[PDB]
Amino acid sequence: PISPIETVPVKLKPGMDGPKVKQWPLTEEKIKALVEICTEMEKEGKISKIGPENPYNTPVFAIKKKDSTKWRKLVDFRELNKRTQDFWEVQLGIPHPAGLKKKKSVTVLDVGDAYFSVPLDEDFRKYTAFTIPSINNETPGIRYQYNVLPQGWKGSPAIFQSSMTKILEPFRKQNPDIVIYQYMDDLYVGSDLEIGQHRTKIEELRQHLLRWGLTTPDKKKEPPFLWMGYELHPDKWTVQPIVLPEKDSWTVNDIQKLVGKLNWASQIYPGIKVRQLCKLLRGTKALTEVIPLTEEAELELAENREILKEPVHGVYYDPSKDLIAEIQKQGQGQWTYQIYQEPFKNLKTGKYARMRGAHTNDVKQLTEAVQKITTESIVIWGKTPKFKLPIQKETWETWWTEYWQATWIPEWEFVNTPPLVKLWYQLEKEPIVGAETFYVDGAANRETKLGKAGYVTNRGRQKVVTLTDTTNQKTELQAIYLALQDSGLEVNIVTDSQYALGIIQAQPDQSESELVNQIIEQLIKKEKVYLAWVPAHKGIGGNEQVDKLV
Amino acid sequence: ETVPVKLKPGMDGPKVKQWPLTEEKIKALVEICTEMEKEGKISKIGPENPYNTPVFAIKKSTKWRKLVDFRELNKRTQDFWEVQLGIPHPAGLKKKKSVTVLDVGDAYFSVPLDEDFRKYTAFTIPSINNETPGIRYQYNVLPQGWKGSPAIFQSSMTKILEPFRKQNPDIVIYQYMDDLYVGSDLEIGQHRTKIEELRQHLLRWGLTYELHPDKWTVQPIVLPEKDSWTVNDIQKLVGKLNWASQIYPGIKVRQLCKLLRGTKALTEVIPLTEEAELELAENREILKEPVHGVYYDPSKDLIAEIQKQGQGQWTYQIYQEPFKNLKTGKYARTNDVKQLTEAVQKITTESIVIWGKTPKFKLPIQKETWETWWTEYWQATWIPEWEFVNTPPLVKLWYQL
Numbered sequence A: 001p002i003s004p005i006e007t008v009p010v011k012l013k014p015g016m017d018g019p020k021v022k023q024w025p026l027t028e029e030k031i032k033a034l035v036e037i038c039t040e041m042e043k044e045g046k047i048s049k050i051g052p053e054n055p056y057n058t059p060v061f062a063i064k065k066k067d068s069t070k071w072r073k074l075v076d077f078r079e080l081n082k083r084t085q086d087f088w089e090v091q092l093g094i095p096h097p098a099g100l101k102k103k104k105s106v107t108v109l110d111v112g113d114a115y116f117s118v119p120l121d122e123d124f125r126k127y128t129a130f131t132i133p134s135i136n137n138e139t140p141g142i143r144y145q146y147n148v149l150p151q152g153w154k155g156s157p158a159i160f161q162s163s164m165t166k167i168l169e170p171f172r173k174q175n176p177d178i179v180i181y182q183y184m185d186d187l188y189v190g191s192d193l194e195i196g197q198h199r200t201k202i203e204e205l206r207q208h209l210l211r212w213g214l215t216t217p218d219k220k221k222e223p224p225f226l227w228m229g230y231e232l233h234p235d236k237w238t239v240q241p242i243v244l245p246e247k248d249s250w251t252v253n254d255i256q257k258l259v260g261k262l263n264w265a266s267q268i269y270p271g272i273k274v275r276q277l278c279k280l281l282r283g284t285k286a287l288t289e290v291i292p293l294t295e296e297a298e299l300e301l302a303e304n305r306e307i308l309k310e311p312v313h314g315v316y317y318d319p320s321k322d323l324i325a326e327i328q329k330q331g332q333g334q335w336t337y338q339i340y341q342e343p344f345k346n347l348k349t350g351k352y353a354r355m356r357g358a359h360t361n362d363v364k365q366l367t368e369a370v371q372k373i374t375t376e377s378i379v380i381w382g383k384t385p386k387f388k389l390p391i392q393k394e395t396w397e398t399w400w401t402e403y404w405q406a407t408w409i410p411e412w413e414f415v416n417t418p419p420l421v422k423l424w425y426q427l428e429k430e431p432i433v434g435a436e437t438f439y440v441d442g443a444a445n446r447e448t449k450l451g452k453a454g455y456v457t458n459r460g461r462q463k464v465v466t467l468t469d470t471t472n473q474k475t476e477l478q479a480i481y482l483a484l485q486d487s488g489l490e491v492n493i494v495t496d497s498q499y500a501l502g503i504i505q506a507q508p509d510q511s512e513s514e515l516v517n518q519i520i521e522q523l524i525k526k527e528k529v530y531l532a533w534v535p536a537h538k539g540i541g542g543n544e545q546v547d548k549l550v
Numbered sequence B: 001e002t003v004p005v006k007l008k009p010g011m012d013g014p015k016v017k018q019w020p021l022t023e024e025k026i027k028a029l030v031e032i033c034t035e036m037e038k039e040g041k042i043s044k045i046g047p048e049n050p051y052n053t054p055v056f057a058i059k060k061s062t063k064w065r066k067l068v069d070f071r072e073l074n075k076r077t078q079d080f081w082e083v084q085l086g087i088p089h090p091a092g093l094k095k096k097k098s099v100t101v102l103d104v105g106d107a108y109f110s111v112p113l114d115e116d117f118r119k120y121t122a123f124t125i126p127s128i129n130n131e132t133p134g135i136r137y138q139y140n141v142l143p144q145g146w147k148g149s150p151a152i153f154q155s156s157m158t159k160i161l162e163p164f165r166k167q168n169p170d171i172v173i174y175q176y177m178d179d180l181y182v183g184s185d186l187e188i189g190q191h192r193t194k195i196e197e198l199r200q201h202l203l204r205w206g207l208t209y210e211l212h213p214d215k216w217t218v219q220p221i222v223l224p225e226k227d228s229w230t231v232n233d234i235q236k237l238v239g240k241l242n243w244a245s246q247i248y249p250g251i252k253v254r255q256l257c258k259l260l261r262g263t264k265a266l267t268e269v270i271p272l273t274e275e276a277e278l279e280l281a282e283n284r285e286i287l288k289e290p291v292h293g294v295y296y297d298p299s300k301d302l303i304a305e306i307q308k309q310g311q312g313q314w315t316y317q318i319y320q321e322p323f324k325n326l327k328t329g330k331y332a333r334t335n336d337v338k339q340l341t342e343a344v345q346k347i348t349t350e351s352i353v354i355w356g357k358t359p360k361f362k363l364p365i366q367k368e369t370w371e372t373w374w375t376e377y378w379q380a381t382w383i384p385e386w387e388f389v390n391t392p393p394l395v396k397l398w399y400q401l
């Protein structure tokens, strides 16, 4: 059939004109297949034959379907497509299982010849004109244009989906207790009716579909339904079965695929880790290239295989209960979380591993994870969860106040699931009486990359060292590290590097810079550190005396 | 009869992704849009409209209100609302004893939008878990939030106000987006009485809080007065003046850092010099006044920087070229995001009164955090542009109170 629904108005991009490509001469047997196919399409209304006038044309080709001797009709709409207006995005975003509700009965209807069942804007049809060439091109070809959404044309998915949405409206409105998800040419229908009342509703749906031009193959499975990588059952869900190969040798390709499968399994299997495997993927190697698994990667692989052996499932969402989200520190930079409404029946799980910057601490990362989980929740359930976090209220509020960025997390509670997130050192807020004042300074030469880092103290100690192929910012870090390793448990440090000061007063407990990690271990060992800044070259006492020596 | 509206040449309409929304806000938007539809304000659109602009719901008062984020559209229509016709900003406004802000957004709902421009005002109501296609609309009437609407209603607005303006020549009324700003030097009771009077004119054409721009004074960089001074105290002092030197002509530091000689313990006390004593005195005299050499340039964007100072205190500066402060200030009186949100609306309001322009904000927060939450506390019908920055920790120190 061809749906009685109104057409969608379609135009070409504002500058442009319709396609005018010349038809390539075709093999005699492709011409023959094309005539057969087109004759059948033309009898169903899909296409109408035309004669110039119509000045447009787009090339048609024909391929033999697999080994099985059917021919398919290919049109190449490249040029019409480059010339066609943009459409709204079909529907960007697909449902997550953790967000679905339980259903007693589900059925999957697929729409026959979906695109060819929807009419094309009458005014636009001429631009779809194509030509079956005569044998060896010797006489004029047979010319058609589409009356329906062509396969391969830019507008088809969007217009089909909008048509189906308009056609589903009345049925959704008259049947609020039943639910229908649209995707491409499939319809996914679910209800809390018993098989009998439900099958009856399906038939009213099909009847309603067919009233509108859309056939749905008749009444010939049960759960589980395989859907978008998932396995859906009436009151639970899991990912579709994951199989991790056994191999003595892993190619870049094998490892990429394994990380993808593991990442996918991490939606419901708690505590999957991929850090060690992912480090293998670092660098510039060929897909076919074999990568020896390091020891940590080999253990991580094991740890995961241990998690994957027996199946796990998630449950569906009950709109009448709160969502609880719990987070644990896993590896380093690795965070894992579970979301449930009844402990501990997870609606789903997840990973967070992102690094924001070169230097961070656990408190900052935990907050970022909380932010990522909050957004995921808005999307999946339409509200934010109550959190349970391995951080003390006192720790959190000590960080939030003293830090210079604004932050905020929704309702949360401490939960004692070590490792607990802590601040590993605090910087003093006032100069320390009786602590040696180290005036530090670092400076590098621009074209030599040769630097000096050093200090003078009020107690008369002095020291300068040479550094090779360094930057100005590294030497300033070097100077501060120097002062930390040569001082007692209490020490005041005066620098002129806002760079160095920015990093350290942020209170990092982890960094990509080795130097910075050295400074950090050093900061944890101290009992008191006060860090101060002065303007350089402004002739400040201690500054322009360790600046003069460096 | 509608006014023809053109985009800026070479630019296509807005294509901005709809932010995810909570259940309650989506419900409120469906309700509202179902009503605006039945009234003809907006109509359902099909997939042949590719454009999109984000929408949100805000809580004014317990009543949901729809808010359309037209920042992209406004930016892509800018030629139209700024320099064809366009609305003069009165210098007198910032000088009045009292300015009252009146929402007149309802006025646009009664004016048709140019049929060929409607498609650019498309927006989408999303669904939870992406389970159904978003609900899609465009506008048939002048939309609240679009800078084109006041530009277009301008002519009608001065007809509505002519009687009242003629009868009270000392009152300044300025339109910006959805709001009317009304300023007088009357005593507060007489001022309020006149606002009521104005409300009554408004009411005949279909329209059913208080600022005191005088009480707006600079927040100077302040130099502490102190009993005694430590080396550390002097060094902070020198750095704050050093940086003020970047802004204020005449700042002097020389005979102050003379005190910081050799390498001294941070905690050691050092006596105050005749010389120095005069400097910070004269520097204070300087920091008290407006910056010599800095003037507003109307062809340039305003920028606002904000610093979190702690204990619910926030400092801000408004400039066009960094360090050339047109204005500095503070906001005070504990959710960080809520406070930042309030501060941004306050600063945006003053900026509207003073320059008839909204600043682009440099916000001291995480992009992702701001976006989740600002909706919860936002109460204005406009939205300024913003980016996200890490406050240079020293800048925070030099603006502390």
Ligand SMILES: Cc1cc(C#N)cc(C)c1Oc1nc(Nc2ccc(C#N)cc2)nc(N)c1Br
Residues within 6 Å of the ligand: A095, A099, A100, A101, A102, A103, A106, A107, A108, A179, A180, A181, A188, A189, A190, A223, A224, A225, A226, A227, A232, A233, A234, A235, B131
């Ligand atoms: C009906 C349906 C089937 C399949 C498919 N395939 C996939 C989707 C996205 C479906 O839509 C919905 N399904 C459910 N629950 C659900 C419950 C059990 C089973 C099973 N078994 C499947 C889906 N809740 C919704 N709100 C929507 Br909308």
